[PDB]
């Protein structure tokens, strides 16, 4: 069980690293396009071609501080807008929680691994069908991103924000939940 969780920690770590890439690249103003490979490389996580932006990797690792989501401790990617006036506005908070309840029957490694791959595919899809997407590409305005870690605070979204469930994946340590709250 010790190796399996060492593997699962790695899977969750790189899932979190990769969701931050997907979310930020989708708020990047330009279209994203990667290529499949029948002869892949050893760093195509979850059988998906997601190019890491170093600077984004940096503060994904500074935010996590070498830690992983858990109880009451959930990773958040905040997409914001600074206008010509300079007043900030919280557009979306992307939330990767790690619920308490577990799935002791789900067989690590690659059941979880393959289901996290599907969730990154769901995340690629949902990241283009929220209003902050079309806003981030129609470019006057600028988009800001920021990653932090703990309890989630939805206050800057304003009263009445909507939420989108991206999906969930159950693991023996708890079930991951990926969602978004946006104004």
């Amino acid at each position: 069980n010790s190796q399996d969780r060492k593997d699962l920690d790695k899977f969750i770590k790189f899932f979190a690293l990769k969701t931050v890439q997907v979310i930020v690249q989708a708020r990047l103003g330009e279209k994203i396009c990667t290529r499949s490979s029948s002869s892949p490389t050893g760093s195509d996580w979850f059988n998906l071609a997601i190019k890491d932006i170093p600077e984004v990797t940096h503060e994904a690792k500074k935010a996590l501080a070498g830690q992983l989501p858990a109880v009451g401790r959930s990773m958040c990617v905040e997409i914001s807008l600074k206008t010509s006036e300079g007043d900030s506005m919280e557009l979306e908070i992307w939330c990767l929680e790690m619920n308490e309840k577990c799935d002791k029957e789900i067989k690590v490694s690659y059941t979880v691994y393959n289901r996290l791959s599907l969730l990154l595919k769901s995340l690629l899809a949902i990241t283009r069908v929220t209003p902050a997407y079309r806003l981030s590409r129609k470019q006057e305005y600028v988009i800001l991103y920021r990653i932090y870690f703990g309890e989630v605070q939805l206050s800057g979204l304003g009263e009445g924000f909507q939420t989108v469930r991206v999906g969930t994946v159950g693991t023996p340590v708890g079930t991951i939940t990926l969602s978004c709250a946006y104004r």
Partner: protein
């Protein structure tokens, strides 16, 4: 075998992109990297690429797997539906995307195609007459397609059932291994121009 039905009300020119948006979204979730088997029975899994598709007739962008041949296959049968829709008229069509496994059967009976999941997108085409028609339509169906993709993701995340991983000989009973850059689950795309059925009882 589970079924999901979606409806879109779209202008005539936007029917192709709206369908590609639905089909690709489903197939992105219903495919994996290609399998390369070893004689020992193990296999490696290739990498899937994805790319953004900007719609012109709709203010909308979807994500499809970067296979150029899969896109050509769907654009073709989407065009078959497009042509059939305009050849017919009035009392309106629907396209279906179904996933199935191939089961072996004793001679003489040929192999059984057993659906585990089917998607039907019913299409209502509306006619437009000013230019404000076209522009506000470009906005309106884009917002509608956002709802659809969100609903597709939220049924896809149910993790209801999926066929078990095939062995080297069973692979062509579960996957479409005929493509270069992705192996979808074995799928079938048929369409159908239906009639319009009224409504009986309120139930007020």
């Amino acid at each position: 075998c589970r079924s999901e039905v979606l409806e879109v009300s779209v202008e005539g020119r936007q029917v192709e992109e709206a369908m590609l948006a639905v089909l690709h979204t489903v197939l992105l979730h219903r495919s994996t990297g290609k399998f390369h088997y070893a004689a020992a029975g193990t296999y490696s899994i290739g990498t899937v690429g994805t790319q953004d598709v900007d719609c012109d007739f709709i203010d909308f962008t979807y994500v499809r797997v970067s296979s150029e041949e899969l896109d050509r296959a769907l654009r073709k049968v989407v065009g078959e539906f497009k042509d059939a829709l305009r050849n017919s008229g009035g009392d309106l069509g629907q396209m279906s995307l179904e996933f199935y496994q191939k089961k072996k059967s004793r001679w003489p009976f040929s192999d059984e195609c057993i659906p585990w999941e089917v998607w039907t997108v019913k299409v209502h085409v509306v006619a437009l007459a000013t230019e404000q028609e076209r522009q506000i339509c470009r906005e309106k169906v884009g917002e509608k397609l956002c709802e659809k993709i969100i609903n597709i993701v939220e049924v896809m995340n149910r993790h209801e059932y999926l066929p078990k991983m095939p062995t080297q000989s069973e692979v062509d009973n579960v996957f479409d291994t005929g493509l270069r850059d992705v192996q979808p689950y074995l799928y079938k795309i048929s369409f159908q121009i239906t009639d319009a059925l009224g409504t009986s009882v309120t139930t007020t």
